[PDB]
Design a binder for this molecule. Structure first.
Ligand SMILES: CCC[C@H](CC)Oc1ccc(C(C)(C)C)cc1NC(=O)c1nnn(-c2cc(C)c(OC)cc2OC)c1C
Ligand SMILES: CCC[C@H](CC)Oc1ccc(C(C)(C)C)cc1NC(=O)c1nnn(-c2cc(C)c(OC)cc2OC)c1C
Lengths: 280, 278
């Protein structure tokens, strides 16, 4: 059984996920729409090619088929839209962290440093909960992103297919979010041991939950599988971040909030600082 | 062959068609699109006319609009109102090039263009219609339909007319015969336009005899005239249903309101009068 401290830790995380994750994407509007290492960027960008479907309240459907790779900026057509979506998702991640009692008690320098290092990873974990592995589509309410064994080569697509195969619960997803958020080895964190103390209790709570709720033989070593996925997500974060910084200086697409996340801390992270001081 | 006067009439009509028909639709711009957000009688008609909008981009991307199943039934009417308006402005310029049309009084020029507006649009639309795929290919824009379709007279017209496989000269002659209809409302010089229409029909009949196999196309001219008569029926059939829709959900552009009668002949068609004098 779970200790009372662990039972209330899970309920606080799940309560935070409910209040901050707009699974229907009803409040996501006002977004843009399409009107050697460079070759590796283009190849991975081609592997991540998706078609955008926008369903309307009346029943109509707008569908956007991306262009084919012919050399030029046409393969970066959906990046401005994806930058508006990532910013909307990250704002929900900010509100998720503010609701957590263990997070708001941290200094404002560590709150910015932690959210800077876990922004991409927290966004990927929420995307996997709406990812359709049967059709290769991210069902984001009114919006859909359908991909166009060789695509599993791209580590970001393989991560979503492998993570979806585990069939995690809501409690396990939100515990992965906490472990990813309270990483003591992020750049800029000062209270290394304090956030390390918090991270271990989330992993201990996750390990206790799985042992008390998943006796099935298909769930053997599930906790260690999850921890191995979090280490893999740390890598893909580095792979995708360096990939986008190379696209940003050639073809600028990042929203003002994304530029701060990529690089006093509160002085060059004004948008994130004001959002941390605001309320629900 | 044809007489020199008939050869000049065809050369003049082909010259007008070339200068005023944008076959690529490259100059069709700034049109409304569906946003991202007898009632049963009319609803059945345009439900049979339900089409999807495809929009090809310069880079190769394709935006496709899927209309909704049965106010949502009139989602593509603002866009079609901008399309019909763009088409008519080319119809006006087509009539202004024909010498037999300028010499008519400005009131009769309005009356003829008012009665032949819908018909000359369908005739030009037919030249870009693909019967195999059921799509009107208007350059970057495509309109694909969504035996059940032949019951609709407007769809049966485009399929039967395309089946005749007319030449460019036969299409523009249909436009002239349709334009110079002597029985349009408000026409005063009916005797002049009747004799003008007869010369176009005689030229069309003579063209078919001289440029087609004699026994195979023995009734091609009479088939064409039957299509024009059928097109007049569809004209009143589509004008009434849109006049009903306009009272419910306004969509017609200012120029369409004058053509339908929404508020002297030139005083009730100020926009159409101005375009004729420019
Ligand atoms: C991967 C699964 C989810 C999506 C479908 C919904 O799949 C795609 C499908 C297609 C495309 C293309 C448009 C083809 C490039 C992109 C993506 N996906 C991203 O482009 C993304 N995913 N995360 N981030 C990101 C987010 C934040 C807060 C951040 O802050 C430091 C940094 C980030 O990247 C370094 C980002 C920017
Ligand atoms: C049939 C071939 C043409 C198109 C595709 C190219 O197919 C459609 C496909 C779908 C739809 C719907 C939006 C579903 C209703 C309409 C249409 N089609 C028209 O909406 C039209 N066709 N002609 N007219 C029109 C034009 C003029 C100058 C006018 O002035 C007196 C009056 C008119 O209507 C009475 C008009 C207004």
């Amino acid at each position: 059984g779970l200790t009372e401290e662990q039972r209330m830790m899970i309920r606080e995380l799940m309560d935070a996920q409910m209040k901050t994750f707009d699974t229907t994407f009803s409040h996501f509007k006002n977004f843009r729409l399409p009107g050697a290492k460079w070759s590796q960027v283009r190849k991975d960008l081609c592997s991540l090619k998706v078609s955008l479907q926008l369903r309307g309240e009346d029943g109509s459907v707008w569908n956007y088929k991306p262009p084919a790779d012919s050399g030029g900026k046409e393969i970066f057509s959906l990046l401005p839209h994806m930058a508006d979506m990532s910013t909307y998702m990250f704002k929900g991640i900010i509100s998720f962290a503010k609701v957590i009692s263990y997070f708001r008690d941290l200094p404002i320098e560590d709150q910015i440093s932690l959210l800077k290092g876990a922004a991409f990873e927290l966004c990927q974990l929420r995307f996997n909960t709406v990812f359709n592995a049967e059709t290769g589509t991210w069902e984001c309410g009114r919006l859909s992103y359908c991909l166009e064994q060789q695509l599993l080569l791209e580590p970001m697509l393989k991560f979503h297919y492998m993570l979806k195969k585990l069939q995690l619960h809501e409690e396990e997803y939100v515990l992965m979010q906490a472990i990813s958020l309270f990483s003591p080895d992020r750049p800029g964190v000062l209270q290394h041991r304090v956030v390390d103390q918090l991270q271990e209790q989330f992993a201990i709570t996750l390990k206790s939950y799985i042992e008390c709720n998943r006796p099935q033989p298909a769930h053997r070593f599930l906790f260690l599988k999850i921890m191995a996925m979090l280490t893999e997500l740390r890598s893909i974060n580095a792979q995708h971040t360096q990939r986008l910084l190379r696209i940003q200086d050639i073809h600028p697409f990042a929203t003002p909030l994304m530029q701060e996340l990529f690089g006093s801390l509160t002085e060059r992270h004004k948008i994130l600082h004001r959002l941390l001081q605001e309320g629900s």
